Amino acid sequence: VVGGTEAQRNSWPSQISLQYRSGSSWAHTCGGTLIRQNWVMTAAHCVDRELTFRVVVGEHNLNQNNGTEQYVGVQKIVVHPYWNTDDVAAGYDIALLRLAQSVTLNSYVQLGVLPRAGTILANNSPCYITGWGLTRTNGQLAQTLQQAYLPTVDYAICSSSSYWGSTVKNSMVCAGGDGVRSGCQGDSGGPLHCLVNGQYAVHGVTSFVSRLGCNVTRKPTVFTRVSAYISWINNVIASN
Ligand code: NA
């Protein structure tokens, strides 16, 4: 997250760190959202590689013991069947991961609340992106979980020529684009949390940014719109 601030450690308890095994160690690669005690929602493109993955819930500092972490292996990966990895702009950038164990809930570990199906945010709706991704274009991962305030940019504006044009689909949410704050590599898969009727819900799964850089004016971060996939998610969980 570029232009973020450190999150309080109990602010975003559905955020997870998706990590892969890197020699004797584990490395953060993507974010996600805990949606059942044994299921995580992330981006399809985060699980394109044939790696060994684990999820960490209750994580705040990637590089220090927080005393709140639970570490769980990934047992099954269900990627959206229309996902095509060399075509992120087509959408369907979403995957569900079934965890090997069910995690225990507490003030650091909670299920993410999803929007009702079909819900679309009014232009300029208040939202926060969270993650441990790069803090500058071509920079390094954050140590501690970051948040940035990224108001939505509606489809009509986001799909206009000076923004993303045809690349942005109505199955996506755009947020930010101020040139200062954004998602960045390592944030993919994580939540966009939007305050609606007094309650934060996870409206977006972080999908892509510009190749011109993370924080680029009129290239808002693009997320999979969770409310387009409510039936899909329920179908997968019911059938596994
Ligand atoms: Na930690």
Swiss-Prot record:
The keyword Disulfide bond applies. The active site is at residues 45, 93, 188. Its cofactor is Ca(2+). One of its GO terms (molecular function) is metal ion binding. Keywords: Calcium, Disulfide bond, Hydrolase, Metal-binding, Protease, Secreted, Serine protease, Signal, Zymogen. GO terms for cellular component: extracellular space. The keyword Ribonucleoprotein does not apply. Binds 1 Ca(2+) ion per subunit. Pancreas. Basal layers of the epidermis, hair follicle and sebaceous gland epithelia (at protein level). Ca(2+) binds at residues 59, 61, 64, 69. CDD domains: Tryp_SPc. GO terms for biological process: proteolysis. Its EC number is 3.4.21.36. Residues 1-238 form the Peptidase S1 domain. It is found in: Secreted. Pfam families: Trypsin. It comes from the Eukaryota. It catalyses: Hydrolysis of proteins, including elastin. Preferential cleavage: Ala-|-Xaa. It is an enzyme of class 3 (hydrolase). Disulfide bonds join 30-46, 127-194, 158-174, 184-214. Belongs to the peptidase S1 family. Elastase subfamily. Serine proteases that hydrolyze many proteins in addition to elastin. PANTHER family: CHYMOTRYPSIN-LIKE ELASTASE FAMILY MEMBER, CHYMOTRYPSIN-LIKE ELASTASE FAMILY MEMBER 1. This is Chymotrypsin-like elastase family member 1. The lineage of its organism: Eukaryota, Metazoa, Chordata, Craniata, Vertebrata.
